[PDB]
Amino acid sequence: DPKIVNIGAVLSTKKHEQIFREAVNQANFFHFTRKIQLNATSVTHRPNAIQMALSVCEDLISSQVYAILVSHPPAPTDHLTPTPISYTAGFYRIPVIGLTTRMSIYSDKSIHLSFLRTVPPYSHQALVWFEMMRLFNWNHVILIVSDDHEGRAAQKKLETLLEEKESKADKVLQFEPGTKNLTALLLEAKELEARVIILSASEDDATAVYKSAAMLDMTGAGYVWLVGEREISGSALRYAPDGIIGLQLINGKNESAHISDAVAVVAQAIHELFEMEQITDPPRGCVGNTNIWKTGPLFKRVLMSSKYPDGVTGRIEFNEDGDRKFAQYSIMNLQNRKLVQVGIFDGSYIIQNDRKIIWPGGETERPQGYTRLKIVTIHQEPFVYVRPTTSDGTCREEYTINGDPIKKVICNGPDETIPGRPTVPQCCYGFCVDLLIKLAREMDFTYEVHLVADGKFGTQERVNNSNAAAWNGMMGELLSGQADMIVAPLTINNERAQYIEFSKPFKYQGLTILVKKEIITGINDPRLRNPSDKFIYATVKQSSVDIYFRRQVELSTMYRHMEKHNYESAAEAIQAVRDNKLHAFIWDSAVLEFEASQKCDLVTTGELFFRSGFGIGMRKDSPWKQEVSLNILKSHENGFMEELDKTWVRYQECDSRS
Amino acid sequence: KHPNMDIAVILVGTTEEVAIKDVHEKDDFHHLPVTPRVELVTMQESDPKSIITRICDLMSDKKVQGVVFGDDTDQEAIAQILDFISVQTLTPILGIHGGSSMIMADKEEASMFFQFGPSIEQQASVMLNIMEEYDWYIFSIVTTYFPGYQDFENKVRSTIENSFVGWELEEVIHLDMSLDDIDSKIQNQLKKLQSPVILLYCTKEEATYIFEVAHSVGLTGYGFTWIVPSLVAGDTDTVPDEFPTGLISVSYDEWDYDLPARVRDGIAIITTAASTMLSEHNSIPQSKSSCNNIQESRVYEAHMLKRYLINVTFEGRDLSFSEDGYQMHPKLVIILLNQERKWERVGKYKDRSLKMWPVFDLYSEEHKDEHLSIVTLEEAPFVIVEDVDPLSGTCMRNTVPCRKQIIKRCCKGFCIDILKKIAKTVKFTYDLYLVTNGKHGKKINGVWNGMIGEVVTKRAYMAVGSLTINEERSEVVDFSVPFIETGISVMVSRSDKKFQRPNDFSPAFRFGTVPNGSTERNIRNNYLEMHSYMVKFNQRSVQDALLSLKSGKLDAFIYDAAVLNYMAGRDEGCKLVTIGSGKVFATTGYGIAIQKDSGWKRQVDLAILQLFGDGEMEELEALWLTGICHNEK
Structure with a gap:
């Protein structure tokens, strides 16, 4: 039936x-x-x-x-x-x-x-924006929402998308509907560094948004706009800014x-x-x-x-x-004050239509997004070099072995040349400097660098009560804020790591020993294990190696023998072996191998132990480091580092002697 | 001159056809500037159509400016419906009993609706006062998607954070009654929670299903107790015994004041709001009531009425509302389900303060408690499975029983002995079984496998074996200190990048390891090319991997260092040896799983190094670990 x-x-x-x-x-x-x-x-x-x-x-x-x-x-x-x-x-x-x-x-x-x-609801449109944000690599944006279940839901959805990533609330801005003048809130928006904007509102509200935004000239280039279907439509379309990016659901x-x-x-x-x-x-x-x-x-x-x-x-x-899931939207552009399909979005992946991209103001292609950095360093020979600027004149046109002129920058740092120690204007050029400027072209930032007053990078020290003072050296400047970011050859370790955020390693190296070739079995050398007053093994007190010796219990006995006859700086430490004052020298390879090439009278031996990496220091609170690592990796993949080590590690004259 | 307001009231139910008509409205407090004009109507059973039609029908030209609703019903939904009409009419409506009094979704601000039930927040507060009174510190919350969730979760969060006491929130559960379950998904979650005191939140109907399921789960019994808001108890007149006995919940009392007294309160509120609004603007509140047409003009002006109506007082009694439309502090009674079907009062609670009647006891090793089941896997020498003598029927000597779901197998070895000494020292007893899925833990995409799974599923407390240590597993579960020096290593007959590429060397080189291992995962993490190349050289089992090394067709083998060293010592011929001094990279040791920060924990650790502390480990090493090879030393 x-x-x-x-x-x-x-x-x-x-x-x-x-x-x-x-x-x-x-x-x-x-x-x-x-x-x-x-x-x-x-x-x-x-x-x-x-x-x-x-x-x-x-x-x-x-x-x-x-x-x-x-x-x-x-x-x-x-x-x-x-x-x-x-x-x-x-x-x-x-x-x-x-x-x-x-x-x-x-x-x-x-x-x-x-x-x-x-x-799908208007909130789900954020799926596009994250994918959009994903492609263009802008992690920094601003969100403008009306205050209601609609706007707040959109915010929740996008933020939830961001939650899988490190949560990104670059900024968020809430305004309440029906409000004709929004000017103050955008005045607050400009102060935020991130130059990309996304907004959700009703048509009438959007009119007011664009109307207020145009007054402060936020519709200009260097700024990006991402929006909902409702925003492009209606009276809002009339007052809409040029080059805006927009969405329309299909059917x-x-x-x-x-x-x-x-x-x-x-x-x-x-x-x-x-x-x-x-x-x-x-x-x-x-x-x-x-x-x-x-x-x-x-x-x-x-x-x-x-x-x-x-x-x-x-x-x-x-x-x-x-x-609904997996719905398709058609991206829309405002070219010549008219709606055009730049691309169409279907499924989880965007699709690019043949039409040329438009950005606000005049751009043939302009994906632009996102004010000072105080940088600190130490005097380490391979990755940093120090010469004073000749008179007032700045820097030498000296050229790398591969024909290129050497880049250079000004740095204020400790001078031992005068009997008293003035913080002295100096010229410094380095691998880390080239890296820093590479970032500076890549990154929105501008840089001013001064070397830390203390020759030491940093170590915890001083007074007993509570926890008193702070680790002496450039690191201490970082927490103090004397420099907001640290660019130097710094090994990366947990004891430091809790205090501060660490950039992904530009370099990978481990400790080793320098001894003259011309006539040390392991990291564990019976000869170390069999110390002798007659056979010296030398290091720098307050060097991170010393922190390895103090923090580690297992070798804690072995530390003391090293503690004897310590040297203050790298040059003196290499010199002692060169002068033959000290039979052996212990330091991380990245500083040492370059020297090993530089003389060849001296040699490195054994296997890098305490295998570690060198990275750029930042406070955990600062989000710029998120880009830095992101940038560091991008610099690794292309072989930029390989060519930079190839430039600054000469490799010219030396070999395995035996 | 004479300002007579127009008002209507309805009663549903009352257990009578010929429900008591116009019992009230009799002039009281006549002094109030506006006199009430009342029309009373009753309807027997509730419907969206019946109620909507009737209320609009009474609206007619009549132009009523207020409505009070009352019901015999247990129904949750009713309030929202009348509220919807209010949103449409902008005509005030409130309710004195039952479902209308039962909580509802957050009211639209423009809308005007009021309930004589207590605030969700208030109720949560009372639930907390009740738990504090019996000093039940540790509790969990089971909730449903019904409205007020997260207003409730938030309210509990706020109320809880402030207090000094070290109370514990154990779990919060959100389950959609919609997408009704074949899975008994609610059974699957509810089964998890171990907490003694449970707060439940849902619709009257939902509580039944959740409770039947709890009865299956075993959650209603013996030491666990449940605490409930107004909604589940509702009227309290009808109680399916699906609800467990000893169930604790708050509700408004019928005895203190009867329903007509409550209706009198409602009328008084409406006419007092009218009188105050009058005093302020000298303006008649009366408005055209008809819903069908557009809302009458100057009714838009009505907003101020709500603003006036929120707090109202008569008879030395405060009716003051909250922004949501619940009354700020109606008197409330703590109620329990007495044995059988009785709802018998236990406590009274009012304003800031609460008072409860019963004194005490309302409604096995001293040093330590519970039991621990353990899972392991077989590997030589450390954990060896043997088949017990069938004639004997049970395990012999050092062998301890372990079961594998597919049969009793007999486990003995290093893990068995270390475990045995540890059990002897800490003095607890334990059940041992064998893992089925994935042996040592393995990750495919998103999910874990192996003994670690049984550690996560709480089917195992501690996992023992030849299991290596890594950052991920240390992250998910606390590990014991390493008892033995081990790690990745090589075994061959007899960092250079020879491993990094085979192709650099013109003849093809060969090396492989067992898949789903901590070694293979570590390899994939640090060195990709080695993994992608070695997948071809991967071997089924250590005996078979050994077959690839021993008979030829493979050059080098890579595996755990302890196993490779013991195998170095033990071989049919001294045909196999370690690499260099056998000094291993990724220096590690065998650990033991635990759940999380809560565990016997440190007590275990001490026991372990006591084992070496007396020098037993050297003996056990000579017996179990020591091989005959490495004889020329």
Whole structure:
């Protein structure tokens, strides 16, 4: 016997009702009519909420609908005019499917628990922005939202996207709707370094946003705008700035495609449903039933999981909230004050249309985004060199072995040349300097460098009570803020690591020993293990190696022998071996190997132990380091470092002597 | 001149057809400037259509300026419905009993709706006072997606943070009643929580399902206790015994004041708000009531009424509301389910302060407690599985039983002995079994595998074996200090980058390791090319890997250093040796799993180095670890 299973809907016009019934009949024809049949019922939108709710309880539910479809009316009244149905069906847990409601407030299962849609909300548009942000590599942006469930939801979604990454709240800006003048808030926005902006608001609000933004000239180049579908449309389009980036959902305007597809999905869901037993028909009529419909949540469960990827609208799958997944948007550009498709977005991946990119103001291509850095260093020969500027004149045109002129920068640092020690203006040129300027071209920052007063990089010291003072040296300057960032050859260790953030290593090296070749088995050398007053092994007190000796318990005995006859600086330490004052010298390879090449009278031996890396210091609180590492890696992949080590490590004359 | 207001009130239920009509409205406090004009109507059972139709029907031309709703029903939904009408009408509506009094989603600010039920926040506060009174410090929350969640979670969070006491929030659970479950997903979560005192939040109907499921889970019994808000208890007239006994919840009392007295309170609030609004603007509140047409003009002006109506006082009694529309502090009663079906009062609570009646006891090793099941895997020499003598029927000597789901297998070896000494010293007893999925823990995409899985699933407290140590596992689970010197190493017959590329050497070179190992994962992390190349040289098992080395067809083998050293010592011929001094990179030791920061923890660690502290480990090394080879020394 056939069984007539009703469906119900509220649609804009009788023609669309006919479209609905037609799609339903297509569903009946193409699936078993012997077992089950589908029947269609629908009604036009009513002027108030109440006539319509009454229509659902009377005109629809009296027909025992298993589900309801809803569309936005011809003239939108306020917003979320399909609010009542979600509540009304919701009492009985009758599933509701909206065609045209992109509104975000329906995403919370709590308030509307029966609500599903064939379109993603405005909040989900953020999926694009993250992907957009992903491609262009701007991690720094600004978000401008209206204050309501819509804007706050958008913020939550985008931030949630960012949560997988280090959470990025570069800045967030909330304004309340209906406010004609927003100027002050944007004045606050300019102060924020990040130059890319994204906003969500209503059309009327957006007019005010662009109106206020143009006054402060934030529509100009070096600034980027990302926006919602609503923002580009309407009166907002009229006052919209040039070069803006914009979004439009596909088939958002059409109810009918979504009708055919939604009903198709409903049919698949039902036919999949009746495979299950212990089913109950929905309540007949509103009157006399105070009870929910036990099947309804199940119908929702299958319907959310209902696949059928082939559809007139595109791929169909439903997120947890019942919102649609994998929807497609078409990116839009404002070129010549007109809307154009620069690209189109479908699935999880953006697609680039052949059209040329536009940015605000004049750009053929301009992806630009995102004020001082005090930098500190130490005098370490391979990665840093010190010469004073000749008189007032600045720096020598001296050239690298590969023909290039040597770059150089000014640095204020300790001078031992005068009997008293003045902080002296000096010229410094280095591997780390070339790296720093490489970053400076890559990074928005500008740099001024002065060498730390203390020759030591840093070590914890001084007074007993509480914890008193702080580690002496450039590191101490970093915490103190004397320099906000540290560029030098610094080994990276946990004891320091808790105090500060560390950039990904530019270099990888480990400690080793220098001894003259011309006539040390291991890091563990019996000769070290068999110390002798006669055979010296020398180091610098307060050098990080000393921290290795003090912190480590296992070798703690061995530290003391090294402690004897310590040298103050690197040059003196190399010299002692060269002078033959000291038979052996212990230091990390990166500083040592270059010297090993430099003389060849002296040699490095054994295997780098205490294997470590050199990195640029920053406070954990400063986010610029996030880019720095991100940049460091980018510098590693291209072989930039390899060529820089190749330049600054000469390798000219030396060999394995034996 | 004469300002007579227009008002309507409805009662549903009352357990009567011919429900008591117009019992009240009788002139009281007539002095108030506006006199009430009342029309009373009753309807038997609730519906969205019936209620909407009737309320609009009473609206007609009648032009009522206020409505009070009351019900015999337990239904949650009703309040929201009437609230919706309010949003549409801008005509004030409130309710004195049952569902309308039951909590609802946060009210639209423009909308005017009020409830004589307590605030969600207030209720949470009372629940906290109750727990504090019995000094039940440690508790968890089970909630559902119903509205007020997270207003509740937040309120509990705020109330809890301030207090000095070291209370513990154990778990918070959010489960959608929608997408109703075949999975018993609620059973699967609820089964997890170990906490003694549970706060539940949901619709009246939902509580039943959650409770049947709890009854299956075993959560209703013996020492655990449940505490509930207004909604579940509702009217309290009807109580499915699916609810467990000893269930504790707060509700408004019928006895103190009967429903007509409450209705009198509502009428008094409406007419007092009218009188105050009058005093302020000398203006009639009366407005056209008809919903069907557009809302009457100057009704938009009505907002101030809400502003006036929030706090109202008569009869020396405060009706003051909160921004949400719940009354600020209605009197409340602490109620319990007495044995059988009784709802019998336990406490009274008002304003700031709470008072409760019962004194005490409302409704096994001294040093330490519980039991620990342990999982392991077989590896030689350390953990050896042997088949027990069938004639004996049970394990012999040092062998300790271990079961593998697929049969009793007999485990003995290094892990068995170390574990045995540790158990002897810390004095606890334990159950030992064998792992099935993935042996030592293995990661495919997002998820962990192996003994670590049983450590995470809490199917195992501690995992023992030849398991190596790494940063990830130390991150997820606390590890014991290393008992033995071990690590990655090489075993061959007899950093250079010879390993880095085979292709540099014209003949093809060969080296491989066992997959799903800490070694292979470490390799993939640091050295990619080696992994991608060595996947071809990967071997099924250590005996088989040994087959690849021993019979030829493979040059070098790489594996754990302890195993490679013991194998160095033990070989059918001294055909195999270690690399260099066998000094291993990635210097590590065998650790032991624990759950997290909460564990016997340090107590274990001490025990371990006591083992070496008495020198037992050297003996055990000579017996188990020492091989005969490395004989020419």
